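The following record pairs a protein chain with its ligand, N-oxalylglycine.
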Amino acid sequence: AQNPNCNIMIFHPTKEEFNDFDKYIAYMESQGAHRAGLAKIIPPKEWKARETYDNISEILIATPLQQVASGRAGVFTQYHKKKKAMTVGEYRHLANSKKYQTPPHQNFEDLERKYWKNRIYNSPIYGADISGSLFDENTKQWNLGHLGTIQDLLEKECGVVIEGVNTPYLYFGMWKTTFAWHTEDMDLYSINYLHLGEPKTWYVVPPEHGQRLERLARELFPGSSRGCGAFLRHKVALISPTVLKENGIPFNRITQEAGEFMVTFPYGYHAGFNHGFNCAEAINFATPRWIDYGKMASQCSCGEARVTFSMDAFVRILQPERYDLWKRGQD
Ligand SMILES: O=C(O)CNC(=O)C(=O)O
Ligand SMILES: [Mg+2]
Ligand code: NI
Ligand SMILES: [Zn+2]
C-alpha cells in the first residue's frame, strides 16, 4: 500500500505532466496521495495563472463575513456576521490596518502558535465564497474555471444526465480568517489555488480516520451533536492541533504559499487559517473513485447546512433513500 502513514505529499509536475488534469490526479493517487486527505501541487516554472494581479481591486465582496468565535482557545465555534459590501481594494486596506494586520512573527510556526493562542479574541473579516475566477481564459492547464464538471462525471460513470452547474469561488482572506473542520459537499474533492498574498495553513485528517474526528467533535460540541447527526456540515467548529494530539486524532498540517495548488480528497476533513491578506480560488470536482464516497456521504437535514442548487441531483441519484429528508432540510 502506498503512503501507509498518510503523509501529505508534495508534487512537482513537469509542463508535460500538467496537460492532462485527470491523468495527474490519478497518478497522485497511484502514489498514495489521497491517503493523507490533502496534497500540494507546485506548478511547473513555465506556468502562470494570469499575467498580473494589478487590476483586481474593483472586484466586489458583496457580503464580507465577520467571523465571531465562542468557546475556548483550542475548542471554539464561529458564526458569520454579515457586513456591508466592499471592494477588494477596500478589503485589502482593511486587512493591512493596525486592527487586522498580521503581527510580527519569526516564522510560520511562531505565527501558528499565535493563531491558536489568540484567534478567539478577535473577529477577522473573510471575503469568502464569491462566484468567479482569476484564471486567464488563455491559461489552458489547471484552469479551475475549465475543469470537467461533476455533472458530466456522474453522467459518464453512471449514465444519468442531470441538471446543475459547477463554477469556482474566490476567497479574499486576512490574518486569522478561518475555515472550520469540514469535508466537501457530498464528500467531493476540492482544488484550491492561492493566487496571491500571504500563506494559508491547512490541517487534515486522513479519510480512513475521519470518523475519529467526528466522534471527538460530538464529545466537544455536545449540544450541536444533539441538534444534528452531521453538524460538521455546518462548517462552524474548530479544534486545535494540540487538542487533536491530546485526543489521539491522526492529522497532518502544511502551509500553502502563493502560486501553489492544494487538492483535498473525498472525505478528507480539513480546517485552517490565513496568515494575512490573500486571495484563493477553489472548486469541487469528482473522479470515478469519488462515486462510492458520494453514495455514503453524510448529510445535514436539520436545516442549517443549506447548499447549492446542484447538490439536489447528487442526493437524488446517489442517495435516493435520504432524498426526501434532506430536501425537507433544504426547504
Ligand atoms: O480557503 C478556504 O477558506 C477554504 N477552502 C477549502 O475548504 C477548500 O478549498 O476545500
Ligand atoms: Mg477589478
Ligand atoms: Ni474545503
Ligand atoms: Zn444540520
